[PDB]
């Protein structure tokens, strides 16, 4: 009941009902949480 009307507007900003900006980009990245998956960096762990 709290968060009913938050949605992504046509310029990729996540706005409230009164158009109060909540995030400049959805999830801070801009991607849907449906087409992502786990990977590894393989650059931070090894030694110098």
């Amino acid at each position: 009941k709290s968060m009913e009307s938050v949605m992504v507007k046509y310029d990729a900003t996540v706005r409230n009902s009164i158009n109060q900006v909540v995030q400049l980009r959805y999830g801070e990245d801009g991607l849907a949480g449906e087409s992502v998956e786990f990977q590894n960096l393989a650059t931070l762990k090894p030694s110098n």
């Binding site: 900003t13 158009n19 109060q20 900006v21 909540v22 400049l24 999830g27 801070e28 990245d29």
Partner: protein
């Protein structure tokens, strides 16, 4: 005791020398890393019946961009502060031509002096602190991201790039610890820079109202 008292006065001093360095004032380099025994030798070994009187500790600094605008900080002597006692300072500012002033209150102030500082709005702006709060730099904590205050020329670039008004930004009230650490007035915009795990870096803005 005094060993606890010579320790605190050095700690509180080291904090303020960064607080005024953040606001963009000019502080000499070695003043930032003034170790304890160096402080103990310069200003005095002990303030209990000693040379450090909580006066002889005051600081006057000048801005980087302009040598005229200066800031003062006062260390009152009484635990809680009265009325003319700040007017003693208001007179000390009146004589030296300085508007930016701070007072490091020792333990408290009277509802009296709360009325006596909100009146001189257009001139002689003073900031009231507490001795306890200045004992630790909160800006170097883990949870606190990095804030930066934007000039009034940059703020008009946001609202014209994202085609925003100034009512549509996220808000911050000028009463929380970091709003006062930077000396922020209503109508300013502060920029937060935090690292995130999905993108790597994210910049958000806050309107102080």
């Amino acid at each position: 005791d005094d060993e606890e008292e010579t320790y605190r006065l050095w700690k509180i001093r080291k904090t303020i020398m960064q607080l005024c360095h953040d606001r963009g004032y000019l502080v000499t380099q070695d003043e930032l890393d003034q170790t304890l025994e160096e402080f103990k030798a310069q200003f005095g070994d002990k303030p209990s019946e000693g040379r450090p009187r909580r006066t002889d500790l005051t600081v006057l600094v000048a801005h980087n961009d302009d040598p005229t605008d200066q800031m003062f900080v006062f260390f009152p002597e009484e635990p809680k502060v009265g009325i003319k006692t700040i007017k003693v300072y208001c007179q000390r500012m009146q004589e030296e031509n300085i508007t930016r002033a701070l007072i490091v209150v020792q333990q408290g102030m009277t509802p009296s002096a709360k009325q006596s500082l909100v009146d001189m709005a257009p001139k002689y702006i003073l900031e009231q602190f507490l001795q306890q709060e200045l004992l630790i730099n909160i800006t170097e904590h883990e949870l606190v991201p990095e804030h930066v205050v934007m000039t009034k020329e940059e703020v008009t670039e946001l609202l014209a790039r994202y085609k925003l008004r100034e009512n549509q930004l996220p808000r911050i009230q000028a009463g929380d610890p970091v709003a006062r650490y930077f000396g922020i007035k209503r109508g300013q915009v502060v920029k937060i820079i935090r690292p995130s795990e999905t993108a790597g870096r994210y910049i958000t803005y806050r309107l102080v109202q």
